[PDB]
């Protein structure tokens with residue numbers, strides 16, 4: 294979790310570096326245990342006919358979080374990516390924390406973050422709604438509309454092109470705020486009924502199936518590793534459907 298040994302970190306976009314550090318700091322003092330990705334994946338690289346893609350993976354678990362996945366990637370020299378999801382244990386009914394930053398030579402092109410619902414009514418639990426509303430509406434100059442598969446995201450979802458350093462920092466601070474709310478709610482969550490656990494499991498399955506429709510991720514993976522590898526990676530490593 295200490296990113297001091299990361300090969301990629303020193304070379305990544307500064308907003309990605311700050312967000313990676315914030316996520317790792319959020320996790321550092323939790324009751325962590327390792328989570329073994331398929332084939333005990335850590336670092337991987339690939340190339341076909343174009344640029345090489347390099348990926349670093351860290352993954353943990355706690356009693357409240359089934360799988361806490363932080364991934365850093367770089368395609369060639371330009372394109373830097375941070376991907377993070379905390380997949381909840383359905384027993385506790387917590388939402389899904391996720392974020393993705395994509396950056397190039399010209400700066401950050403996409404910054405997305407959310408606490409995504411798992412309830413059948415598509416709403417965050419009441420305590421989250423309350424705490425999130427109290428943060429206020431953040432202002433960003435260049436909002437982006439989610440694609441249709443993004444119906445999975447809550448009304449608090451951020452999806453922007455940051456306009457300047459102030460907005461980069463405002464976005465990272467809001468992600469820190471989401472993490473602080475999420476970690477707090479994890480300590481007050483009670484184990485739920487079997488019917489409720491089942492409901493939350495279904496919401497998490499749906500979230501993964503929709504995230505797998507994102508061709509932006511798929512094309513990056515395919516250009517470096519090919520179709521079969523990308524399908525395995527998206528369905529088994531990034532967005533595994535629990536069952």
Ligand SMILES: C=CC1=C(C)/C(=C/c2[nH]c(/C=C3N=C(/C=C4\NC(=O)C(C)=C4C=C)C(C)=C\3CCC(=O)O)c(CCC(=O)O)c2C)NC1=O
Pocket residue numbers: 364366374375376377378390391392393395402403405406407439440443452507509510511513514
């Ligand atoms: C191997 C990892 C990985 C790769 C290769 C990746 C690539 C990637 N994600 C993208 C968009 C995006 N990514 C997301 C969202 C997310 N994506 C996530 O994996 C998570 C957890 C969320 C949200 C919490 C959305 C909503 C878009 C825009 C999709 C589009 O414009 O159609 C883009 C386009 C950026 C842009 O338009 O400016 C790329 C290249 N994202 C990844 O995470």
